[PDB]
Amino acid sequence: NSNICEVCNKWGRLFCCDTCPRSFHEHCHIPSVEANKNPWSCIFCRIKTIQERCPESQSGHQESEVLMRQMLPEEQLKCEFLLLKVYCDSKSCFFASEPYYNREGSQGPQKPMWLNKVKTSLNEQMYTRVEGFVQDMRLIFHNHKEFYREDKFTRLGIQVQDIFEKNFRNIFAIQETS
Ligand SMILES: [Zn+2]
Ligand SMILES: [Zn+2]
Ligand SMILES: [Zn+2]
Numbered sequence: 001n002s003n004i005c006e007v008c009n010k011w012g013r014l015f016c017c018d019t020c021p022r023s024f025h026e027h028c029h030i031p032s033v034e035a036n037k038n039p040w041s042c043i044f045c046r047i048k049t050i051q052e053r054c055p056e057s058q059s060g061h062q063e064s065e066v067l068m069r070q071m072l073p074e075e076q077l078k079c080e081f082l083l084l085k086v087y088c089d090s091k092s093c094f095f096a097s098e099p100y101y102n103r104e105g106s107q108g109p110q111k112p113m114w115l116n117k118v119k120t121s122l123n124e125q126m127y128t129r130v131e132g133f134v135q136d137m138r139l140i141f142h143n144h145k146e147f148y149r150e151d152k153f154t155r156l157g158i159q160v161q162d163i164f165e166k167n168f169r170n171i172f173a174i175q176e177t178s
Contacts, residue, residue, distance in 0.1 A: 002016075002021055004023070005023060005024050005025045005028050006023060006044075007029070008028050009090075010025075015033040018039030019041045022044060030043065030083055030084045031123065043080060047171070061172060066172045068131060070128065070130075075130055078172060079122060079127070079130065082171050083119060085167040091159055092160060094144075094160070096114060097115075098116070103148075106149060108147065109143035113136050113140045117136075118133065118140075121136070138161075138164075141157045141158075141160065141164070144157035145157050
């Protein structure tokens, strides 16, 4: 097993996966690491098993059809994983916790959004469709672009959104296009 958390790259109280060499802090893993369960398989292993059980799940999909899927167990798991992939980028720190807005020449967004709020929403099963989750995720970056305007800090929103969008396309096997 690794000696650092796969998500935040720090040592600490880690839980180790029984089917691969990754380790996690308790609340870095999504869902939070389960109390008992021996053996324990992490989210990366569980996502890999889904593909192995149904190889055709990797054939290309249209984004519009993906978004309308109901949040059944396997879609729930894929959203958890995609959220996890965002938290794996160190730049996610800027978007994790509840923001505030007081900048000369800007007004705060009508609907603030942050990664820990989306984490809670998934945990409490508040999204009925994939679209719910993806809308909130995109809203995080949109709110950041609009607020920071021409400050170069707007780029952080672009950069973390690109991580989100690449992972979305990979996890949900969106049809490759030019
Ligand atoms: Zn961690
Ligand atoms: Zn694993
Ligand atoms: Zn099959």
